Structures are given as C-alpha cells and as structure tokens.
C-alpha cells in the first residue's frame, strides 16, 4: 500500500508523509517505463578493478543497476560501493558467479540499520554527509540514506536478498582468477557490456561487406530478395549500434526480423532457429542469434 499524503493548511508535518510520497513517485515512474518496456530492470554499469584478483580480492569501482522492484542503485551519484569481496574461500572452485545483493523491504518497519544484529538484514543505512546549498553560499551536514549493498556468490544462500549478476570469475591458465571474457549481466543498456558491442560490430561489418559484393552483381529472385532484406535492415541496425544507449529489447526485435527473413532461403537451419528473449540470461539469447546471423549471412 502507498498512502499519498494530503497537504493542507493546519496539517501537521510528518516524516511519514515524505516517505509515502517518495514511494508514490517511484511507483509512478515505474508505471511509465512499463508502457513500452517489458523488462525495465537490469544493469547499466558493472565496472570492477580486476588488478586485485591475483590477490583474492574483487573490488567494484562503479555499479549502476535497476532492481526488479524499481529500486535504483547509482554509485556515481547517490550510493556507496560495497565492501571488497574475499575470494580466499573460493579456493576449491574454478568458476564463480558474483551478484549484487540488496536486502528486501520490511513491511512492518525497522528498515534502517541501527547497528544491532538481526535474523533479517536491514536495507538502509544512515550516513552524515556535507551538502552544499545550491541557492546560496553555505554548507551543512545532513543525514542521507544509502542502500545496504554487498557482493555475494551465487552458490551461497541468497533468500534474504534480491540479486542481480555483475561479474563472473574463472580460473585462468596460470591458476589465477580473471574476469570471464564472455559474460553478460541482464542488461538495461547495451553499452553496459563491451563483449556484446564487439560481436555486434562484427555483424554490422559483415553485413556491409556482403551487401556490397551482392550489389555489384545487379533467376535474380534470390539476389534481389537478399539485397532487399539487407538494405532494409542496414539503416536501422546502424543507428541502434551507433548509439548503444537504450534497452536491448529494441535491438532484439530488429535482429530477429533479419534472421527471420534470411531463414526463408536457408535450408541447413531449423525453423525455430531464432531464440526467445530471456532477459535474465542474455547469454542464451544474443551470442546464439548472432552466431545464427553470421552463418545465414555467410551462406
């Protein structure tokens, strides 16, 4: 429940009014996003300092992520980085999935961490910070809220937290830990994962190269059809990749159309070669579809 406050002359000023108002505004913003986007939540930034992996330490540098319940985490502007994750207890493993954990809300209050211990982790922390007044020329210390964020491993119990993948660590040839070159967090912004951008760039290159080769050849049904399909797609895919700053859903639809058409003349692939969109696990969507497109195109 959200109880929008009634502001009026003679009304008392209360902290409950402010807390409920904030909840409403977040809800309203979330409602708007959902008008066009199936899955508004996901990762925007997941930058880590991996220079300390040789010393069994994983240290985040910049994390930005929208959680499944509308909660927005922004290290750059509002939140603090989580404590450094100690990998010394991972010795017996060869692969670890690291997620960012956020404690879930207590319906009956007591959400703020007062330094005491409890069975269920607190969600909010109070800190004192120096804030500059924008209008004038003065500063003061005020209380602000931070989220109680922490890094946890997928193989650990995570019932009490909402989680979102941020990085995956694998043993290298030297026995050292390193970041997996082919790991994709559930994305909210395409630029959040360079691995994907790179593969997409290769696709665009191949499409242009093939299109030009075909075009110079202008019984011709296959030629004209293929050129039409490629020429139609290029002007759109281009833009989407030039500015990789939007929800991946849009890209998926465009790539799916291209694969859909090409499969018409291809014989060596199954009808349902195009994968479903799985927001939670992009690794089972994009690299598959992209590999398909590369083969369909090369053929």
């Amino acid at each position: 429940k959200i109880y929008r406050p009634l502001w009026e002359d003679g009304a008392f000023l209360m902290p409950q009014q402010f807390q409920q108002q904030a909840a409403w505004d977040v809800h309203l913003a979330d409602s708007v996003a959902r008008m066009g986007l199936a899955h508004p939540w996901g990762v925007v930034a997941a930058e880590f300092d991996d220079s300390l992996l040789p010393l069994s330490r994983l240290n985040a540098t910049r994390l930005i992520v929208r959680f499944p319940d509308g909660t927005l985490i922004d290290t750059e502007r509002a939140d603090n980085l989580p404590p450094v994750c100690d990998l010394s207890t991972v010795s017996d493993r060869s692969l670890v999935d690291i997620v960012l954990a956020l404690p879930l809300l207590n319906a009956n209050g007591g959400n703020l961490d007062n330094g005491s211990e409890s069975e269920r982790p607190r969600r909010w922390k109070s800190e004192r910070v120096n804030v500059q007044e924008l209008a004038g020329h003065e500063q003061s210390e005020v209380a602000v809220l931070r989220h109680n964020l922490t890094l946890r491993m997928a193989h650990q119990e995570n019932a009490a937290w909402l989680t979102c993948p941020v990085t995956r660590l694998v043993r290298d040839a030297q026995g050292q830990w390193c970041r997996d070159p082919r790991f994709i967090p559930p994305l909210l912004t395409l630029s959040a994962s360079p691995s994907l951008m790179t593969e997409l760039a290769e696709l665009l290159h191949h499409l242009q190269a093939r299109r030009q080769r075909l075009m110079s050849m202008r019984a011709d049904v296959s030629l004209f059809w293929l050129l039409n399909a490629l020429n139609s797609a290029e002007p759109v895919l281009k833009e989407l990749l030039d500015m990789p700053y939007r929800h991946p859903e849009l890209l998926y639809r465009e790539l799916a159309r291209l694969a859909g058409s090409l499969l018409t003349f291809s014989l060596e692939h199954n009808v349902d070669a195009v994968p479903a969109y799985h927001h939670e696990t992009p690794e089972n969507v994009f690299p598959p579809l992209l590999s398909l497109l590369n083969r369909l195109l090369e053929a």
Binding site: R128, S140, E141
Partner: protein
C-alpha cells in the same frame, strides 16, 4: 592590543552546540615571529579551556596586526555527547 568575543553557533553530530569566540589582537613585534606567537597562543588556548564554563566550546583567534593575518585554534578535547 585588544580583546573581543562573540557567541558561536555550531553543529556537531547533528546537534546544535554553543561556544565562545575569543579574539585577541597582538602586536607581532612583541614576539620572535610565528614561533613565539604560536606557542603563546597554544598556552592561552589551553588556559581558556581550563577557565571557560561547562557545555561551552572555546576557540582562540590571534590577529597579527602588522599584517592582518591570524592563527586559529579550533579544537575540543573534552569528552562530550555521551548519548
């Protein structure tokens, strides 16, 4: 040369505390430069702490009249805000 004081309104750990601003103007020619001025001020600051009343913080400002610059002592060694 001169002694003046002002009320101080300051915050600490979210609480509003009272204090006293003690400002003294000195003729810098009476001291062997900053070495002596500082040590004199350090003593005076300590003395004020032992003279001033309870629930009051005190700071010392010394002005070097020949130049207009000053040295400020802004510290509090007293146990406080137990709860």
């Amino acid at each position: 040369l001169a002694v003046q004081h002002h009320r101080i309104q300051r915050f600490e750990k979210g609480f509003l505390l009272r204090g006293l601003d003690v400002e003294v103007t000195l003729d810098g020619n009476g001291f062997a430069g900053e070495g002596d001025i500082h040590l004199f001020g350090e003593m005076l600051n300590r003395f004020l702490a032992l003279y001033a009343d309870m629930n009051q913080f005190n700071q010392l400002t010394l002005i070097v009249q020949p130049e207009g610059k000053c040295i400020r002592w802004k510290e509090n060694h007293n146990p406080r805000l137990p709860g």
